[PDB]
Design an enzyme around this catalytic site. Sequence first.
Site, mmCIF file in Angstrom:
data_model
loop_
_atom_site.group_PDB
_atom_site.id
_atom_site.type_symbol
_atom_site.label_atom_id
_atom_site.label_comp_id
_atom_site.label_asym_id
_atom_site.label_seq_id
_atom_site.Cartn_x
_atom_site.Cartn_y
_atom_site.Cartn_z
ATOM 1 N N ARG A 85 13.388 -0.182 6.251
ATOM 2 C CA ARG A 85 13.139 -0.844 7.534
ATOM 3 C C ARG A 85 12.274 -2.086 7.318
ATOM 4 O O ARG A 85 11.322 -2.033 6.530
ATOM 5 C CB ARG A 85 12.452 0.189 8.440
ATOM 6 C CG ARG A 85 11.935 -0.320 9.790
ATOM 7 C CD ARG A 85 11.530 0.866 10.635
ATOM 8 N NE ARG A 85 10.729 0.511 11.795
ATOM 9 C CZ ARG A 85 11.191 0.002 12.917
ATOM 10 N NH1 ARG A 85 12.507 -0.119 13.121
ATOM 11 N NH2 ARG A 85 10.329 -0.333 13.871
ATOM 12 N N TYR B 48 4.449 0.945 1.894
ATOM 13 C CA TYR B 48 4.551 -0.039 2.976
ATOM 14 C C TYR B 48 4.010 -1.404 2.523
ATOM 15 O O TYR B 48 3.289 -1.520 1.512
ATOM 16 C CB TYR B 48 3.741 0.374 4.188
ATOM 17 C CG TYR B 48 4.377 1.458 5.042
ATOM 18 C CD1 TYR B 48 4.636 2.727 4.534
ATOM 19 C CD2 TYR B 48 4.757 1.196 6.335
ATOM 20 C CE1 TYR B 48 5.247 3.710 5.305
ATOM 21 C CE2 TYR B 48 5.343 2.184 7.132
ATOM 22 C CZ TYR B 48 5.625 3.433 6.607
ATOM 23 O OH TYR B 48 6.192 4.435 7.393
ATOM 24 N N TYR C 294 0.677 5.263 1.131
ATOM 25 C CA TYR C 294 0.022 6.366 1.825
ATOM 26 C C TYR C 294 -0.095 7.559 0.875
ATOM 27 O O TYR C 294 0.703 7.730 -0.050
ATOM 28 C CB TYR C 294 0.778 6.697 3.095
ATOM 29 C CG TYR C 294 0.580 5.776 4.260
ATOM 30 C CD1 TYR C 294 -0.622 5.723 4.936
ATOM 31 C CD2 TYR C 294 1.568 4.928 4.685
ATOM 32 C CE1 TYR C 294 -0.807 4.897 6.026
ATOM 33 C CE2 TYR C 294 1.380 4.060 5.737
ATOM 34 C CZ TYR C 294 0.199 4.070 6.449
ATOM 35 O OH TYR C 294 -0.008 3.199 7.502
ATOM 36 N N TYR D 231 0.811 -1.185 0.000
ATOM 37 C CA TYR D 231 0.000 0.000 0.000
ATOM 38 C C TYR D 231 0.863 1.260 0.000
ATOM 39 O O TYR D 231 1.984 1.268 0.496
ATOM 40 C CB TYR D 231 -0.951 0.020 1.184
ATOM 41 C CG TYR D 231 -0.293 -0.222 2.518
ATOM 42 C CD1 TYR D 231 -0.047 -1.534 2.958
ATOM 43 C CD2 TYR D 231 -0.092 0.826 3.424
ATOM 44 C CE1 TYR D 231 0.443 -1.766 4.227
ATOM 45 C CE2 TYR D 231 0.414 0.583 4.683
ATOM 46 C CZ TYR D 231 0.714 -0.703 5.069
ATOM 47 O OH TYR D 231 1.170 -0.895 6.355
ATOM 48 N N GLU E 291 6.029 -0.431 19.494
ATOM 49 C CA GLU E 291 7.327 -0.812 18.951
ATOM 50 C C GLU E 291 8.407 -0.575 19.985
ATOM 51 O O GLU E 291 8.277 0.288 20.879
ATOM 52 C CB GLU E 291 7.576 0.039 17.713
ATOM 53 C CG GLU E 291 6.546 -0.293 16.667
ATOM 54 C CD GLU E 291 6.832 0.263 15.287
ATOM 55 O OE1 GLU E 291 7.875 0.891 15.113
ATOM 56 O OE2 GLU E 291 6.069 -0.042 14.369
#
Lengths: 168, 169
Positions: free
Chosen positions: B50, B28, B22, B20, B73
């Site tokens: 990451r 991501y 943003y 997807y 996280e």
Amino acid sequence: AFESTRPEELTGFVGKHLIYTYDNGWQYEMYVKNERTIDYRIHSGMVGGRWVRDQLVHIVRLSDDVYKISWDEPTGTTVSVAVNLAERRLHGVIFFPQWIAQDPKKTVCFQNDHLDEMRAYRDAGPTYPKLVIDEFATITFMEDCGADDETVIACAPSELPAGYAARR
Amino acid sequence: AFESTRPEELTGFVGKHLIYTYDNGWQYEMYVKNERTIDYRIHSGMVGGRWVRDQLVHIVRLSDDVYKISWDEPTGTTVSVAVNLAERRLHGVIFFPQWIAQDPKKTVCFQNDHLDEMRAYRDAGPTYPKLVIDEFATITFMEDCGADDETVIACAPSELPAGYAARRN
């Protein structure tokens, strides 16, 4: 930072006023006062007695029935709530700084009169680990109050008429 | 603490594999590996490169078509994503600690081998103010991989086949 706020998509949600009980028994109340603001009032649980006006929030439409409200608090707490209007089901995730977990009554106040205090507690910490509360809730009472009614959430939970939070 | 996890409510969602983008352009990828676990992989944006395996998450049904995934996280970041499978849209709220806003590349790694480092950066701060990203995304690719497939997210985003992240359905 509020780019995602789209008033035109939120006309079925702004104005809503909900009382709900999480699966852990904590009873909460929220008023969606406008497209970027909520007032809220906690009736029971770890921080029962706490209430808050004029919290800036991010409110989005996920579907025709589902809306999401997310925010950062002056205490360091972060929150995301979703509401399914049709199903009368709410879900919340609350990430509390460790200092609140250790001494939650520190946050039990009308926050808006204790902003400096909250920021001091936040800054002193500890922050971590977070206490993460992720729970469904039953929406026991829901009404439409329209926008910017300043009387919906304007006093402590102890100052309400008898039976207020027990309605429906 | 995982009392809200209800497998019977999640059968349409577990196993999903989503890429997807943003509205700010950040790309991501997430794999819903089981009822309480995701793997994820960031392809572009502030923390592109990451990736993360075996992140414990809270996954809940909001409707027939809408699911929510929330987690904490080791960096101090808190996250809640919602996916609308029918509309192929995602919404994320990400609350980054201030230290990440100032130096986001510090978090660009295979996080699972850098937990102590992430926690050190987290503990040094700054924490506040949070950089809050609240954004819609378009789901460009979605597939069902089933549960516990360890191959879906198993390398850095730089090591994938040439057009991997641009594939669509």
